[PDB]
Structures are given as C-alpha cells and as structure tokens.
Amino acid sequence: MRTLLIRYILWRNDNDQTYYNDDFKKLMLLDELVDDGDVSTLIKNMRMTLSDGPLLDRLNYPVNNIEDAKRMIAISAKVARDIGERSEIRWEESFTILFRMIETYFDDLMIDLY
Amino acid sequence: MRTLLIRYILWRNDNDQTYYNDDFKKLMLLDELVDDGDVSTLIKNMRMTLSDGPLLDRLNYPVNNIEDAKRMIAISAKVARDIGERSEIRWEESFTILFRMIETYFDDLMIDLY
C-alpha cells in the first residue's frame, strides 16, 4: 500500500505513461470525495507561498475514519495533478505525513479498493 | 531526479515489471561501486534489529563527491533489492536522508548518467 500510493501520487504529477499501472483506476475513484474548489484554493496558496506548506497543512489534519484517509489520498492525488510536474516538491516529506496519518488504514483501504 | 530515484529504489524492492523504465538500466550500472559483502552485512544487521536503522546509519554518512552520491544510490538500490518486498520499511524516511545528502548532485548525476 505504501509503495502503490507513492507510485500513484508521483504518476498523478507527471502523467508519465511508462509509470502507469491499472491499480491506479481504483484509486482514481477516490477523487469524487474531494471538491475541485478546495484543490484550486490549496494550489493558489502553494503558489502564493512558493512551497508545499499548504499541502503539508492539509495532510496534518486528523484522520479519524477510512473516509478521512480516502480523502487525504484524493487531496494528495488532485494537488499532485494540478500543481504541475515542473513543481520542485520534496514529495517524501508529503508522503512522511500522509502515511503517518493513513498507515493504520492500509489493510482496510486495500480490502475496500481490491 | 528525485522522482526517478524514488521510482528506481521502489522497483529494486518488488521487481514488478509493470513499474520498470529504461532509465533504470543506467542507474543499475552504479551497483558495481558497492561491494555485495557490505550489503550482506547491512541486511544481516537490519534483520538482527528488525529495523531500517542500519540502512539509515549508512545513509547518514557524509557525501563529499559525486562518487559518494553514486555509492549512496547503489547501497540504497542493493539494500532495497536484498531486503525483500514483504519488508515493512518506511521508504520515505530513507528517501528523506538519501536526498538530504545527494540533492545537490542531481544536476551532475543526470548529466553523468544521461
């Protein structure tokens, strides 16, 4: 789950066909859980501050249920997409926080998705 | 370079052909720079301690030249390979340290490799 999620988020960023996998299709369904307006707001802030700061702030939100986790994956995915591949983001820092929150839900997320 | 290296190390760990890229061939040539005996020693220690601790210790070594960086990538790659896919390693923590040391060499590593 850790690997798959890293691979998926990175893929959402650059859209490199050479790194696409069909397991991404299921994870892509989680996008409906996140409003595009929230993503736009987040991107605007990231650009305003020239940092992943606003993304890390969103990732530092509490995760109390699997739906909360699904949303964090989706927000990471849509931000990754919308920010653009040129964006010099230290992705491992975002993954550190994302997984710090969602790690426990990995077993259930895997069942829920596949 | 950050993305490519994340993708390469993760690929070395699971050997999933669906995540392979031709750019990995060049990075695989760096393996000659690292002795297999050092890797064996490191793996033995990781297993002894049930942690990535010994890997993180190796990654915390100083990087004074591009060859030092090339070796850190190679040690990360061979450890990733030899440890096995089942290994519950928080890869992002290893990437945090690896990139903390090698980040500056990214531009030169890219030229040197491609």
Residue numbers in the entry:
A (entry chain E), B (entry chain B): 1 to 114
From the study:
VACV protein N1 is an intracellular virulence factor that is expressed early during infection and modulates innate immunity by at least two strategies: preventing apoptosis and inhibiting NF-κB activation. N1 is a Bcl-2-like protein that contains a surface groove similar to those in cellular anti-apoptotic Bcl-2 proteins that bind the BH3 motif of pro-apoptotic Bcl-2 members. The VACV Bcl-2-like proteins N1, B14 and A52 all form dimers via a common surface comprising alpha helices 1 and 6 (the ‘1–6 face’).
By analogy with VACV proteins A52 and B14, which have the surface groove filled by bulky amino acid residues and do not inhibit apoptosis, we introduced the bulky residue tyrosine at positions R58, Q61 and R71 in an attempt to ‘fill’ the N1 groove and thereby exclude BH3-peptide binding. To determine if the point mutations introduced in N1 generated unanticipated structural changes, R58Y, Q61Y and R71Y N1 were expressed in bacteria, purified to homogeneity and their structures determined at 3.0–3.1 Å resolution. While WT N1 and the groove-filling mutants (R58Y, Q61Y, R71Y) were all dimeric, the I6E mutant was almost exclusively monomeric. Introduction of the groove-filling mutations R58Y and Q61Y abolished the ability of N1 to prevent apoptosis, while mutants R71Y and I6E inhibited STS-induced apoptosis as strongly as WT N1. In this assay, both WT and I6E mutant N1, where the groove is intact, interacted with HA-tagged Bad, whereas groove-filling Q61Y mutant N1, as well as A52, failed to immunoprecipitate with Bad. Likewise, when untagged Bid was co-expressed in cells, Q61Y mutant was unable to interact with Bid, whereas R71Y mutant, as well as WT N1, still immunoprecipitated Bid. Expression of WT N1 decreased NF-κB activation significantly, as did expression of the groove mutants.
